[PDB]
Design a protein around this ligand. Structure first.
Ligand SMILES: Nc1ncnc2c1ncn2[C@@H]1O[C@H](COP(=O)(O)OP(=O)(O)OP(=O)(O)O)[C@@H](O)[C@H]1O
Ligand SMILES: [Mg+2]
Lengths: 208, 406, 49, 121, 20, 55, 112
């Protein structure tokens, strides 16, 4: 049987309900003195400033009176992926490429900042109608090359990108995916036949 | 830092079949009224079930949505006003609104919806998220292949890291409306006279196949053909829900005939056993080449739509798409639809990738998944940065929606 | 356990705020095809030329 | 063993007649109902067992023994010591193994002089 | 009763014994 | 026979590897430059936690 | 040569992730026996409560929306045995042998 169980939402439709914590579970009478000895703190429907927002709009919360005016705690999560910013001069000097238009590079970087370097999302959102068609490897190559060049110009070191290896990897994956059911069945049949051959060889070696 | 913060936002999910609305943080939409509304020649609008189901002279049945997108903004404003006043019972300027949108919604339509929500309703904040993203969020999945089979379209939408891969969207016209048309054609072939329940004054029990012994309501006012068609569609949808079943494997006449029949009683008292014909209709969703409509057509089956949508994405993400297949939409509630889909996909999926269908086969989890995800998203404390404020709409203008809502 | 070591039950809390950049991102979809650990240099084939 | 939660007799027509005595016993693990022989009613009243009393019943003899009020009903204001006992842990029904080591001389001494004759001894 | 002589204390505050 | 089978399977495997269809020798993936978790990552984690709470 | 069409060529200043070969990968919220990462926040383990003093079966501690710590519970066919399980017939004997060997992680509450 299973040693431990793993699931995201819940393991099965037959799952027992979660146990919620609560007082008074053993009856109200036994906890009468405990509940009666104290009084609840006041809660308010109050506006709160979120410093992560740049506009300054005020939304409303259910919070204790003492918490009024405190900094919003979820604003600590607000941090974007570091992406360099370059001037027209810096691009003309270092980032110029006959294969890439400047407006195209700016669009790529805008998408990169919008989608936190999720290059698959950048490829899906890439404006193939206005600019030239680009593969995700081309976008990654351009981004990493520009980042390396800007770092070397300004200032540490970063690993270089290998577009060719990624292209070969995707090509191999696509070839492995497009194969017919017969070809994959043949691959598994060869795997099992090789395993049985090796097993017989190992048995003969063990006998010797 | 802590649990998600509730800011009293509203979640609206206006589909082609029913308009789902409610307050953020709830586990179920507090209202779902039919999207079709009555119109009397602004024009007088009858929107909810209580008003739609009563006959009225010169009242037409129309829908604000077309191909999953809003076309008539006047009826859309009417539906929103009705939702607020009757069900929400709160001022629009007091609650932020989060609305769902079709994966293929146009830029101009998004801009017009944002302009309407801010100029007319004076709402404090707004956000527009895709139905696929909300469906994925309702299941706790940040990535996966959404498979939605509503009333207008059957669409597979690949979602990665909470973003809809628009290039991978594959849509098919086979949906609830197609099944309704097939049932209408079946009833016509069997010479079954569809009598809407509004025309029946009284009825008497009759034997199977016996002529209906019913009395027509008196003083009935003249009704438009649209309203009569809408009532017939309602009874046909009830038949679809109660009788139709998807075959567990490729349709076979002998196997379908061997299985037991299901008995259904029409509103006019007519009753019959539907034999094997109840199984043939849902097979069109899987094998459209056999449909009487057009055998030589190019429509793709639901499993073929699934496999095509994933095939258009980066192969690095296909393992995630097959590893999380999310089925949604009311048309998927047909009996054994999930089992047949799982079998066909397991047969067609490459053995090198794991296939797993999320066990959400319930009416609430299938129909309201988008609303559930919207409520979840609106209830996150981290999401409070994503809201579009009125000040942002004032400074950035109507175009601000293009950048704030991905 | 049998060795006397003690383990505290994990608690699934909401995400904790970041103190520094140590919260390195992990691609949950990449981990479906490749292991989460970089290949050690000992078993990595030599550089091509 | 467990805390008594009910002592309802089961009335019946004889072929007031009782055919069983249902005793409900509660432990920290759970609750169990026992369809005890009706004759146990004599021992229940002899031991003065009441609802909320911790008892134990041996399988062989079927005689009840009372061991005090459950400590869940003890207040800090009342003064008694022997009459309160904690709720039994473990399952209501228990199988206990007791192993004792003795010598033949121990048995000799025990049977030679068992413990008013006892007072004088 | 205790409530007739003493203020209840707010949660998270140390009891001090304030009367009515 | 066994020697012929071994030689045949070795040639078949070599031909598939030339074609690349040999999945047992898949290429590795180049490590992307490391980055800290962004706002959207924390949002998705909180989303997963809330969705579990909802269910 | 046969590898040459797709041969691996290391480059200076680069690192690579080995592909999954022995077992197909899976989501983090799935057991390592099923190819998953087995992230401990999603793991369900046998748990004993103080009230009632009975093992509730497989459970995982999860913080709720208002900070309320909730015990999620997973169904198992041996739930009755887990209810009878405490203080450390064939199935029961095997379960007891597995637990006594500490092959199963079974949490118990204690004061800090
Ligand atoms: N239990 C059921 N059995 C069969 N069909 C059902 C069932 N419940 C709903 N349907 C059908 O599901 C169809 C689509 O309903 P749904 O609520 O999913 O649509 P929607 O998302 O609002 O619309 P759309 O995607 O077309 O814009 C309807 O035509 C309805 O008749
Ligand atoms: Mg839909």
């Amino acid at each position: 049987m299973h040693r431990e169980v793993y699931a995201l939402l819940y393991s099965d439709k037959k799952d027992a309900p979660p146990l919620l914590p609560s007082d008074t579970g053993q009856g109200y009478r036994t906890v009468k003195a405990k509940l009666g000895s104290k009084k609840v703190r006041p809660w308010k429907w109050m506006p709160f400033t979120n410093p992560a927002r740049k506009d300054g709009a005020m939304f409303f919360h259910w919070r204790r009176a003492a918490e009024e005016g405190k900094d919003y705690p979820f604003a600590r999560f607000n941090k974007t992926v570091q992406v360099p910013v370059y001037s027209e001069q810096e691009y003309q000097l270092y980032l110029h490429d006959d294969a890439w238009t400047k407006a195209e590079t700016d669009h790529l970087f805008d998408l990169s900042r919008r989608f936190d370097l999720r290059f698959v999302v950048i490829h899906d959102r890439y404006d193939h109608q206005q600019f030239k068609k680009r593969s995700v490897e081309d976008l990654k190559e351009r981004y990493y090359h520009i980042c390396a060049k800007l770092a070397n110009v300004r200032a540490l070191k970063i690993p270089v990108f290998d577009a060719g290896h990624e292209r070969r990897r995707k090509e191999q994956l696509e070839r492995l995916y497009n194969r017919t059911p017969e070809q994959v069945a043949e691959e598994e049949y060869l795997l099992q036949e090789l395993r049985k051959i090796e097993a017989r060889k190992k048995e003969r070696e063990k006998r010797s | 830092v802590y649990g998600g913060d509730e800011v009293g936002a509203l979640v609206f999910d206006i589909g082609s079949y029913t308009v789902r609305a409610g307050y953020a943080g709830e586990d179920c939409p507090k209202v779902d009224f039919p999207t079709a509304i009555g119109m009397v020649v602004g024009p007088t609008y009858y929107i909810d079930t209580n008003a739609l189901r009563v006959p009225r002279e010169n009242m037409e049945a129309i829908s604000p949505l077309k191909n999953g997108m809003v076309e008539d903004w006047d009826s859309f404003q009417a539906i929103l006003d009705h939702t607020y006043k009757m069900h929400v019972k709160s001022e629009a300027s007091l609650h932020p609104v989060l609305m769902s949108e079709a994966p293929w919604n146009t830029r101009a339509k998004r801009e017009k919806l944002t302009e309407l929500m801010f100029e007319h309703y004076n709402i404090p904040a707004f956000f527009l998220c895709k139905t696929a993203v909300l469906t994925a969020f309702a299941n706790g999945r940040s990535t996966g292949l959404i498979l939605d089979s509503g009333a207008t379209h059957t669409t597979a939408i690949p979602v990665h890291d909470g973003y809809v891969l628009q290039q991978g969207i594959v849509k098919s016209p086979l949906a609830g409306d197609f099944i309704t048309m097939q049932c209408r054609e079946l009833f016509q072939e069997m010479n079954i006279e569809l009598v809407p329940p509004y025309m029946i004054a009284s009825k008497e029990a009759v034997r199977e196949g016996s002529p209906a012994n019913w009395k027509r309501k008196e003083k009935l006012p003249q009704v438009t053909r649209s309203w009569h068609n809408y009532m017939c569609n309602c009874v046909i949808q009830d038949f679809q829900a109660s009788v139709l079943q998807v075959s567990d494997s490729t349709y076979d006449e002998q196997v379908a005939a061997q299985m037991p029949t299901v008995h259904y009683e029409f509103p006019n008292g007519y009753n019959c056993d539907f034999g094997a014909e109840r199984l043939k209709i849902p097979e069109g969703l899987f094998d459209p080449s056999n449909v009487k409509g057009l055998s030589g057509n190019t429509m793709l089956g639901v499993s073929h739509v699934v496999t095509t949508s994933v095939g258009m994405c980066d192969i690095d993400i296909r393992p995630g798409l097959y590893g999380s297949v999310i089925v949604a939409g009311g048309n998927t509630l047909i009996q054994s639809f999930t089992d047949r889909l799982n079998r066909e996909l397991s047969q067609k999926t490459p053995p090198s990738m794991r296939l797993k269908l999320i066990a959400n086969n319930t009416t609430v989890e299938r129909r309201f998944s988008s609303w559930i995800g919207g409520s979840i998203l609106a209830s996150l404390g981290t999401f409070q940065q994503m809201w579009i404020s009125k000040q942002e709409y004032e400074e950035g203008g109507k175009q601000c929606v293009e950048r704030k809502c991905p | 356990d049998v060795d006397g070591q003690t383990e505290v039950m994990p608690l699934w809390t909401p995400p904790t705020p970041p103190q520094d950049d140590s919260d390195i991102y992990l691609d949950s979809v990449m981990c479906l095809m490749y292991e989460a650990t970089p290949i050690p240099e000992a078993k990595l084939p030599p550089v091509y030329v | 063993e467990g805390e008594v939660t009910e002592l309802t007799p089961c009335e019946t027509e004889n072929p007031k007649t009782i055919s069983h005595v249902i005793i409900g016993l509660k432990t920290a693990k759970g609750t169990k109902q026992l369809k005890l022989d009706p004759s146990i009613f004599e021992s229940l009243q002899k031991e003065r067992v009441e609802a909320g009393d911790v008892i134990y019943i041996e399988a062989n003899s079927g005689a009840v023994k009372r061991q005090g009020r459950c400590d869940t009903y003890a207040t800090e204001f009342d003064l008694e010591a022997e009459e309160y006992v904690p709720l039994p842990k473990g399952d209501v029904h228990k199988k206990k193994e007791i192993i004792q080591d003795v010598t033949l001389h121990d048995l000799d001494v025990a049977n030679a002089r068992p413990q008013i004759l006892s007072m004088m001894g | 009763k205790a409530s007739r002589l003493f203020q209840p204390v707010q949660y998270g505050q140390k009891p001090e014994g304030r009367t009515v | 026979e066994q020697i012929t089978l071994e030689n045949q399977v070795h040639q078949r495997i070599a031909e598939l590897r030339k074609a690349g269809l040999w999945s047992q020798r898949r290429l590795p993936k180049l490590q992307e430059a490391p980055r800290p978790k962004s706002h959207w990552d924390y949002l998705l984690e909180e989303m997963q936690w809330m969705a579990t709470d909802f269910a | 040569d046969p590898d040459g069409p797709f041969a691996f060529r290391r480059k200076a200043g680069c690192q690579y992730y080995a592909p999954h070969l022995d077992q197909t990968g899976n989501w983090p919220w799935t057991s390592p026996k099923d190819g998953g990462l087995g992230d401990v926040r999603y793991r369900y383990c046998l748990t004993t409560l103080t009230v009632p003093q009975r093992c509730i079966g497989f459970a995982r501690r999860r913080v709720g929306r208002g900070g309320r710590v909730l015990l999620d519970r997973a169904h198992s066919d041996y739930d009755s045995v887990f209810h009878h399980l405490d203080l450390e017939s064939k199935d029961l004997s095997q379960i007891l042998v597995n637990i006594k060997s500490c092959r199963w992680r079974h949490f118990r509450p204690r004061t800090p």
